[PDB]
Structures are given as structure tokens and as C-alpha cells.
Amino acid sequence: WRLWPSGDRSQQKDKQSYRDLKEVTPEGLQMVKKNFEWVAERVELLLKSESQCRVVVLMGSTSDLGHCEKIKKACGNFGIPCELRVTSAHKGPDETLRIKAEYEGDGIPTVFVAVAGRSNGLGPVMSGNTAYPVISCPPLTPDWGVQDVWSSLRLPSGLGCSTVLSPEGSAQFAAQIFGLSNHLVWSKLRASILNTWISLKQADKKIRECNL
Amino acid sequence: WRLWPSGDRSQQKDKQSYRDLKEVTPEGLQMVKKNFEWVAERVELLLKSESQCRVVVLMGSTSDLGHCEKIKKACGNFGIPCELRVTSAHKGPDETLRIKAEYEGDGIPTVFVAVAGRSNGLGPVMSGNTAYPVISCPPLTPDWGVQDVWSSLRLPSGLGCSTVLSPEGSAQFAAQIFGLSNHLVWSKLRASILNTWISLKQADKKIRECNL
Numbered sequence: 001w002r003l004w005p006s007g008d009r010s011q012q013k014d015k016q017s018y019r020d021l022k023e024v025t026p027e028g029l030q031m032v033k034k035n036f037e038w039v040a041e042r043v044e045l046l047l048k049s050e051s052q053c054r055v056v057v058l059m060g061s062t063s064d065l066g067h068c069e070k071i072k073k074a075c076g077n078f079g080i081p082c083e084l085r086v087t088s089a090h091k092g093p094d095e096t097l098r099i100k101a102e103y104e105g106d107g108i109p110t111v112f113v114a115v116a117g118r119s120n121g122l123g124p125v126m127s128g129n130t131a132y133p134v135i136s137c138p139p140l141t142p143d144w145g146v147q148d149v150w151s152s153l154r155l156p157s158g159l160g161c162s163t164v165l166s167p168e169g170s171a172q173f174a175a176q177i178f179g180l181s182n183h184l185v186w187s188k189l190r191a192s193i194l195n196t197w198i199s200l201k202q203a204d205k206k207i208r209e210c211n212l
Numbered sequence: 213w214r215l216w217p218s219g220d221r222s223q224q225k226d227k228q229s230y231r232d233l234k235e236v237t238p239e240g241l242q243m244v245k246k247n248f249e250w251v252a253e254r255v256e257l258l259l260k261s262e263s264q265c266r267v268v269v270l271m272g273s274t275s276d277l278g279h280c281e282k283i284k285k286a287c288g289n290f291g292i293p294c295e296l297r298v299t300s301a302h303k304g305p306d307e308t309l310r311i312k313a314e315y316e317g318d319g320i321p322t323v324f325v326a327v328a329g330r331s332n333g334l335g336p337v338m339s340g341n342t343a344y345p346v347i348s349c350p351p352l353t354p355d356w357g358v359q360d361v362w363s364s365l366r367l368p369s370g371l372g373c374s375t376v377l378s379p380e381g382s383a384q385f386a387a388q389i390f391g392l393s394n395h396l397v398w399s400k401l402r403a404s405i406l407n408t409w410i411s412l413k414q415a416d417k418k419i420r421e422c423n424l
């Protein structure tokens with residue numbers, strides 16, 4: 001590769017320092033060795049997380065737990081710790097705000113996922129009372145889903161609350177948010193674009209055989 | 213009329229006491245006079261309210277004020293005092309519960325009307341946190357009303373919250389609740405059934421002329 005500290009070519013740390021010597025002297029080889037050592041002293045830091053990430057899934061009822069386990073598992077695929085909590089905006093709004101505050105208060109950057117079926121008040125109340133992002137991921141079913149979703153979507157002014165229906169999608173959206181400030185999350189999202197694209201190529205190659 | 217204290221005929225207080233005398237003696241006429249006096253000493257109490265009544269209309273935004281004025285005016289027709297307040301379940305849930313508590317705490321029987329457009333969280337949070345009745349009267353319009361109403365209707369278990377779309381209707385429903393314990397409210401509802409029925413008779417009598 002070519003590696004420029006501060007994007008400055010004259011600070012090149014790669015083998016180009018050796019390619020560019022008019023004449024190889026043992027003084028020239030010592031500079032090239034220092035450049036290699038400089039890269040070697042820093043490369044292990046690419047494996048280090050520069051930012052903490054956390055998703056908190058808030059569920060209005062334990063009957064939605066299975067939907068919440070899918071989000072949590074999906075967060076694991078992106079290396080993002082994910083906590084489940086039970087709170088109802090309608091039956092325990094005092095407790096919703098207390099739980100919110102525990103996660104707001106410990107310094108760890110957090111995305112909230114609100115999982116509430118029927119009339120989702122949980123995402124709205126959370127969205128209105130935190131500066132952190134909130135994603136509604138309602139556990140919609142074809143029975144009443146067409147009716148229930150509008151409670152997540154049409155909110156009063158001053159509410160940033162987003163909606164992602166896929167539970168794996170809600171984790172992926174939360175990963176995309178953390179990927180702006182965490183290169184390890186970003187890299188899993190980028191590789192995942194590649195791998196999915198490769199899977200399509202491989203599936204099209206297979207099905208293309210039935211056309212001969 | 214015939215008036216029986218405790219539904220006991222032998223305690224009759226009306227003119228039947230006079231009709232029933234075998235012979236009118238001046239001792240008989242004094243009993244009849246006491247009966248008339250007994251009714252006369254109590255009749256003014258039929259004009260007295262036996263129970264206090266109050267509606268509190270809670271609105272998430274001052275843009276819904278006109279809808280709230282219609283409920284208040286309609287409460288006046290039933291002789292029920294009606295208060296307007298501004299609170300948002302989503303932007304100020306701490307304040308929603310504090311306001312609720314001021315009305316729960318002063319001993320006056322209260323019906324809450326929650327007026328919230330879009331995703332109504334106000335009726336649900338109120339319904340979940342008071343033993344008093346809550347009525348959602350969302351200011352629906354034909355733009356998004358078909359979508360918005362389901363946020364009032366499909367609630368988690370443990371929520372008694374009702375829905376009445378008409379703003380005059382929400383006051384009438386609140387009157388019907390107070391009419392179970394207040395004879396003056398009941399009487400206005402009963403007379404109103406009669407008067408509306410008479411109006412139909414009169415309108416049918418008019419239109420019946422165009423058929424000759």
C-alpha cells in the first residue's frame with residue numbers, strides 16, 4: 001500500500017520510501033526500516049474500538065420478547081452489545097423515564113429500539129424525552145399491522161422517532177448509526193454489502209443453468 | 213301525583229290521604245294539611261345537585277383549541293363545569309401526570325377528555341394512570357383520520373379508554389356518566405331525547421306536505 005500520515009506524500013511510511021532512493025546506502029536502509037517500524041507500532045490499533053456502542057430494546061410486554069431476541073441476536077452480528085428491558089409508556093410512564101435516564105447517564109452512546117404492539121406510545125414518549133436516537137420496531141402481524149403502524153409514523157412536531165419494521169433491519173439501522181463513529185461496525189456493514197452481492201451473483205450463476 | 217315515602221302506601225303524602233277519609237273531620241283535615249306541608253318542606257330540594265361533576269379536556273397542542281371549545285360549550289348545555297388544559301404525553305409526560313393528580317386529588321368526580329391528533333398517546337397514558345374515566349375525542353379530519361383513529365382504539369390490556377369522535381358527543385357521553393349520580397344532568401339528557409324526537413315529528417310533518 002501507500003500510507004501518507006496527514007495525507008502528506010513527503011511523510012510516506014510505506015515501501016515507496018525504498019523504491020524512491022536514487023542510491024541504496026546503509027543510511028537509506030535505516031530510514032526505510034524506521035518507516036516499516038512506524039507502521040508496525042500502529043497497525044495493532046486498527047483492531048481497537050475508538051467508541052462504545054449500545055442498543056437498548058424497550059418492550060411494553062414480555063409477549064413481544066421473541067421479536068426483541070431477534071433484534072438482540074442481529075446486534076451481536078455487528079459486535080454491538082444489546083440490552084432488553086420491560087417498560088410500558090401507558091401503565092408505567094414514570095418507570096419508562098427512570099430507565100431511559102439510567103442509559104442516558106452513564107456516558108455510553110445509545111440507540112433505543114421501542115417495541116410496542118397496537119398503539120405504540122413507547123417510541124413517541126421515548127423520542128420526546130431523549131436526545132439519543134429512537135427507532136420504533138413494532139411487532140406488526142397481518143391481522144392489524146396496516147392499522148397499528150400509523151401510531152409509529154404520524155407523530156406530533158418535535159419528534160425525530162424513525163420506523164423500521166424488520167427486527168434484523170432495526171439492528172442494521174442501529175449499526176449504520178454507530179458505523180459513523182466506529183470503524184469496526186462500519187467494516188462489518190461494508191463487508192456485508194459485498195457478501196450479499198456475492199450471494200446474488202452465486203444464486204444467479206446457479207439458476208442460469210436451468211436456462212440451458 | 214301519588215308520593216310514597218320508602219315506596220310505602222300507608223305513608224302516602226299526596227291528596228289520596230284526603231280522597232280516602234271515610235268522613236272529613238277537622239282532625240282528618242289537620243293530618244291532610246301535615247302531608248301537604250311534608251311535601252312542601254322537601255320539594256325545593258329537587259332543585260339541589262346531590263353530586264359535583266367536572267369534565268377536564270386535556271389537549272396536546274393549542275392548534276386543537278377550537279375542537280376543545282366545542283366540548284366545553286356542549287358541557288355547559290348539561291350544566292357541567294369544563295376545564296381546558298394543555299399537556300403533551302410525548303413532550304411533557306411528567307407534567308401530564310402532575311395535572312392529572314391535581315384533578316384526582318381535590319375530591320370532585322371527574323371525566324377526562326383526551327384531545328390529541330395524529331398518534332394519540334395522551335388518552336392511553338391518562339387511561340393507564342387514573343381510576344376515573346377517560347374518553348379520547350381525537351380531532352380527526354378526512355386527510356389522515358382513517359389512519360389516526362386506530363391509535364385511540366387498539367390499546368394494550370388494562371386500559372379502559374373509550375373513543376367518541378363527535379366533540380358534542382364526548383360531552384354528551386360525559387353527561388350520561390354523571391347522570392348516573394346526578395338527577396339534574398340525567399333530566400337534561402331525558403328532556404333532550406324528547407325534544408329531538410319532537411323535532412323529527414315536526415320535520416316529518418313539514419316534508420309530508422310536499423307529498424300532496
Ligand SMILES: Nc1c(C(=O)O)ncn1[C@@H]1O[C@H](COP(=O)(O)O)[C@@H](O)[C@H]1O
Nearest residue numbers: 060061089090116117119121122368369
Ligand atoms: N403499545 C404498547 C404500550 C405502550 O405504548 O405503553 N404498552 C404495551 N403496548 C403493546 O400492546 C400489546 C399488548 O400488550 P399487553 O396487553 O400485555 O400490555 C403489546 O404488543 C405491547 O408491546
Ligand SMILES: Nc1c(C(=O)O)ncn1[C@@H]1O[C@H](COP(=O)(O)O)[C@@H](O)[C@H]1O
Nearest residue numbers: 156157272273301302328329331333334
Ligand atoms: N398526539 C399528540 C400528543 C401526544 O400524544 O402526546 N401531543 C400532541 N399530539 C397531537 O399531534 C398534533 C400535532 O401537534 P403539535 O405538533 O403542535 O404538538 C395535534 O393535533 C396534537 O394534539
